[PDB]
Amino acid sequence: IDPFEMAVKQLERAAQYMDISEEALEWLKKPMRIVEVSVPIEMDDGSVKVFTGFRVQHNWARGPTKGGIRWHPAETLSTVKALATWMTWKVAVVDLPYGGGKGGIIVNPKELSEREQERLARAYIRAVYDVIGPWTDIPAPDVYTNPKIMGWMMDEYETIMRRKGPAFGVITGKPLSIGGSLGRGTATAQGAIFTIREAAKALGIDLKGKKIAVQGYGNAGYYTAKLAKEQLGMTVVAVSDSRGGIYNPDGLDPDEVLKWKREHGSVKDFPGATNITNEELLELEVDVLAPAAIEEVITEKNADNIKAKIVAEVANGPVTPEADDILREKGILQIPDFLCNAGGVTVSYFEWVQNINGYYWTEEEVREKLDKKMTKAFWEVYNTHKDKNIHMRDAAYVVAVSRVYQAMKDRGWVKK
Ligand SMILES: N[C@@H](CCC(=O)O)C(=O)O
Ligand SMILES: N[C@@H](CCC(=O)O)C(=O)O
């Protein structure tokens, strides 16, 4: 199951719903630049180990490419290419002057010390310097990379760059001390909450007092539940982790559950709550269900059993296309994954804007701008959903690919 293959198939399926020339589709099926580099670092024992690093820039018709860096032992070039392709549509659906791109190093960072991690980050920047920049390619944190590594990478880039321009804007997700942006820790959850609110408004539902079930209790799931309870006033009845689920009709307090999970490593056996598992958790009678964990969790095996009026796909591809079908004919509004979790990329654009301008904002300004962006993106996707009578996801693909195609035509890359 080649990751890249799946992305190309999804793009073709999408192109089956819109008027796009075959030359433009052939252009969009290939990354515009792929860079594979050797990343040599000096280990703590004195030896030199060489790692494999990637930087894929799928498309830059709309502006500089944007995408995170993954440090995973199972990283492959095809995975990076597929993720860069998805990043293109993600920045296009939420309307950002960005293209799509992604990077990665095939490494197990859990067995690297802090000094070796810093050496790896600096060596990666020294290797890929010639294809990145504030107006060329802006990396960001991703799987097993965090703001600390982002700061190390920014410092190395500034050292090579001799401070001749906005070196802060070369990479996002930085610490606040060095050009970091506020509201960035709860970006994804805030965007998901905004999309859920707009979806409820579209469906004619006032969310105050109804049930939400969240699967996955990392930063995304926990903050999704928390912001749901405060901003949307909904009742959080079920949460789960990489172990099991906890359900309470009266409502769970996300802060207490987070304390429980930190203390014991799992959310299981929470006081005054029935312990359950993920499979039966996916089908509680709730108004909103927010899968925020590992991919491929809703499948034709249990798609019919889903009873949530609104499904917000915080995670990347939690729902299979077949389940997309059954959920559609069941009457359930799905927020597509790369529209729902648009908060992350959105915030990163805001941070870049701040770095380029040299002027930073506050929490309220970031929050308001994110609200407007996510509301507009959701409403465009939903209006395409209505007008073309296609799936929500397919509408997101229509919006994003239409924007990229228009940008490609405007530059004259494709003459038709
Ligand atoms: N992996 C992140 C990167 C976004 C960013 O550039 O901040 C995402 O697209 O969700
Ligand atoms: N990768 C995250 C969602 C996307 C993000 O946080 O950037 C998850 O699966 O929970």
Which domains are delineated in the chain? 33-178 (3.40.50.10860), 179-415 (3.40.50.720)
> Is 102 a residue of the active site?
yes
Burial class (CB in 10 A: 0-12, 13-18, 19+), 225: buried
Rounded-to-integer distance, Cα 99 and Cα 87, Å:
8
Q: Within its chain, how far is the Cα of 412 from the centroid? A: 30
Is the beta carbon of 214 within 6 A of some atom in ligand 2? no
Task: At 199, list the tokens.
Answer: 């979806």
Is the beta carbon of 316 within 6 A of some atom in ligand 2? yes
Rounded-to-integer distance, Cα 61 and Cα 53, Å:
24
Is residue 82 within 8 Å of residue 7, measured between CB atoms? yes
Cα→Cα distances 279→26, 330, 363, Å: 40, 19, 37
Q: Which entry of 66, 81, 102, 210 is annotated as an active-site residue?
A: 102
Cα→Cα distances 356→165, 344, 359, Å: 9, 19, 8
- Per-position b or e across 309-341, b if 16+ CB within 10 A of its CB: bbbbbbbebbbbeebbebbbeeebbbbbbbbbb
Sequence-separated (6 or more) residues with CB below 8 Å from residue 91: 62, 66, 98, 99, 100, 345, 349
Sequence-separated (6 or more) residues with CB below 8 Å from residue 171: 138, 139, 140, 150, 153, 154, 157
Rounded-to-integer distance, Cα 132 and Cα 134, Å:
7
Q: Which ligand is nearest to the CA of 313?
A: 2
Q: Residue 358's closest CA among 183, 136, 167?
A: 167
Rounded-to-integer distance, Cα 121 and Cα 132, Å:
14
Mapped onto helix, strand or coil, the DSSP state of residue 65 is strand
Burial class (CB in 10 A: 0-12, 13-18, 19+), 206: exposed
**Which H/E stretch holds residue 48?**
strand 48-59
Question: Which method was it determined by?
Answer: cryo-EM
> Within a 10 A sphere around the Cβ of 119, how many other Cβ atoms?
20
Mapped onto helix, strand or coil, the DSSP state of residue 276 is strand
In what order do the strands lie in the sheet containing 235-240? 274-276, 245-247, 235-240, 211-215, 288-291, 310-312, 333-335
Is residue 209 within 8 Å of residue 392, measured between CB atoms? no
Tell how far the Cα of 294 is from the centroid of ligand 2, in angstroms. Answer: 9
Residue 244 assigned ligand-binding role: no
**Which H/E stretch holds residue 257?**
helix 254-264
Cα angle 385, 386, 390 (rounded to 5 degrees) comes to 45
Rounded-to-integer distance, Cα 225 and Cα 216, Å:
10
Positive or negative, the CA dihedral 147, 149, 154, 155 is positive
Say which DSSP state 285 is in.
S
Residue 219 assigned ligand-binding role: yes
Residue 248 assigned ligand-binding role: no
Q: Note every long-range contact of 265-268, with CB atoms under 8 Å and residues 24 or more positions apart, other chains counting.
A: 266/241, 266/242, 267/217, 267/239, 267/240, 267/241, 267/243, 268/241, 268/243, 268/244
Cα→Cα distances 187→7, 183, 374, 397, 400, Å: 25, 6, 11, 22, 21
Rounded to 5 degrees, what are φ and ψ at 357? Answer: -75, -25
Rounded-to-integer distance, Cα 69 and Cα 380, Å:
29
Rounded-to-integer distance, Cα 239 and Cα 71, Å:
28
Burial class (CB in 10 A: 0-12, 13-18, 19+), 250: exposed
Sequence-separated (6 or more) residues with CB below 8 Å from residue 412: none
Q: Which ligand is nearest to the CA of 351?
A: 1
Say which DSSP state 72 is in.
E
Rounded to 5 degrees, what are φ and ψ at 73? Answer: -65, -20
Residue 103 assigned ligand-binding role: no
**Mutation probe of ligand 1 site: the residue of 348, 349, 350 with most atoms within 8 A of C-beta:** 348
Residue 188 CA: which ligand 2 atom is closest? 6
Rounded-to-integer distance, Cα 83 and Cα 57, Å:
10
Rounded to 5 degrees, what are φ and ψ at 83? Answer: -70, -35
Tell how far the Cα of 344 is from the centroid of ligand 2, in angstroms. Answer: 9
Specify which residues 361 forms β-bridges with. Answer: none
Is the beta carbon of 188 within 6 A of some atom in ligand 2? yes
DSSP string for residues in 207-248: -TT-EEEEE--SHHHHHHHHHIIIII--EEEEEE-SS-EEE-
> Within a 10 A sphere around the Cβ of 162, how many other Cβ atoms?
8
Is residue 304 within 8 Å of residue 324, measured between CB atoms? no
Is the beta carbon of 344 within 6 A of some atom in ligand 2? yes
Is residue 197 within 8 Å of residue 207, measured between CB atoms? yes
Q: Residue 282's closest CA among 215, 335, 327, 224?
A: 215
Rounded-to-integer distance, Cα 193 and Cα 225, Å:
9
Strands 288-291 and 235-240: unpaired
Task: At 16, list the tokens.
Answer: 């089956």
Q: Residue 107's closest CA among 153, 75, 152?
A: 75
Cα→Cα distances 397→68, 93, 389, 401, Å: 21, 8, 14, 6
Rounded-to-integer distance, Cα 206 and Cα 212, Å:
13
